[PDB]
Design a protein around this ligand. Structure first.
Ligand SMILES: [K+]
Length: 282
């Protein structure tokens, strides 16, 4: 299976005019980065709605993953499930991003832009979908196998899913945020994999990236302590190869330099009074 190359982009997909657009739509930058890390009860409830819709959109698009399909098509499907549910696709118009979800095949670490690229037997593809409704965001992603995937790749995907669930299970108030990256990296290294460091999880709420950064590798210098009402993503990218990468001319598509495949899974989490709640569930 040859290394991927930029495909061709379909035109901007329309969104019903009555669905509110986040404030950054169409602008070069977003007004985000200094919002409270702990959300109000109102916002937490709204985030449950957003997270459920994003989860449903991810699941719909994931069902279309099959050899023969284009990533653009996956985008068409998630976009339509969001709009149908009254949600705006947060990535659409986010810092110029042109589509409604990110589709990251094989060696694309993250932020692949859905295009003409056709998926072939044995590929793996991450679909990342964010919903904006009720003035809040919810983000989730998962990597899906297409046809007869090699065992190496099936294990990568399964172990990345397991690393993410183990990290989620450690979320609890009063525990250091750095426990998450410790847990992910220890599990990825058990199998000889490498955890991407330059791309991270993040606080999410009324803004898409609110300033809070969640690392997926071991970095005990971070002193942040998890607090009830904090909302953030856990979304480790795990590489079979080296971490060195390149970003395509589009300014979005990140690919591994050695072209070895990489997988990712993600949920939006809430720190509750005693533990965790996954908000991006159906
Ligand atoms: K990938």
């Amino acid at each position: 299976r040859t290394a991927l190359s930029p495909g061709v982009l379909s035109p901007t997909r329309p969104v019903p005019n009555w669905i509110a657009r986040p404030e950054y739509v169409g602008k070069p930058a977003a007004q985000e980065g200094s919002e409270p890390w702990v959300q109000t009860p109102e916002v937490i409830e709204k985030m449950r709605v957003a997270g459920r819709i994003a989860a449903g959109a991810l699941a719909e698009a994931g069902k279309a993953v099959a050899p023969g399909v284009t990533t653009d098509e996956l985008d068409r499907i998630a976009h339509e499930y969001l709009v149908d549910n009254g949600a705006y696709p947060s990535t659409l118009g986010y810092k110029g991003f042109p589509k409604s979800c990110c589709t990251s095949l094989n060696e694309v670490i993250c932020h692949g832009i859905p295009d003409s690229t056709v998926i072939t037997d044995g590929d793996i593809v991450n679909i990342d979908v964010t919903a904006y409704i009720g003035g809040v965001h919810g983000d989730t992603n998962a990597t899906f196998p297409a046809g007869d995937v090699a065992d190496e790749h099936r294990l990568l995907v399964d172990r990345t899913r397991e690393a993410t669930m183990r990290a989620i299970n450690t979320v609890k108030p009063g525990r250091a945020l750095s426990v998450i990256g410790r847990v992910i990296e220890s599990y990825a290294n058990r199998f000889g994999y490498n955890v991407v460091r330059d791309f991270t999880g993040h606080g999410i709420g009324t803004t898409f990236h609110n300033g809070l950064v969640v690392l997926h590798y071991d970095q005990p210098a971070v002193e942040t302590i998890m607090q009830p009402g904090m909302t953030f993503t856990i979304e480790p990218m795990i590489n079979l190869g080296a971490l060195d990468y390149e970003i395509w001319d589009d300014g979005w598509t990140v690919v591994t330099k050695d072209r070895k495949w990489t997988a990712q899974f993600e949920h939006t989490l809430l720190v509750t009074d005693t533990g965790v709640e996954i908000l991006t569930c159906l």
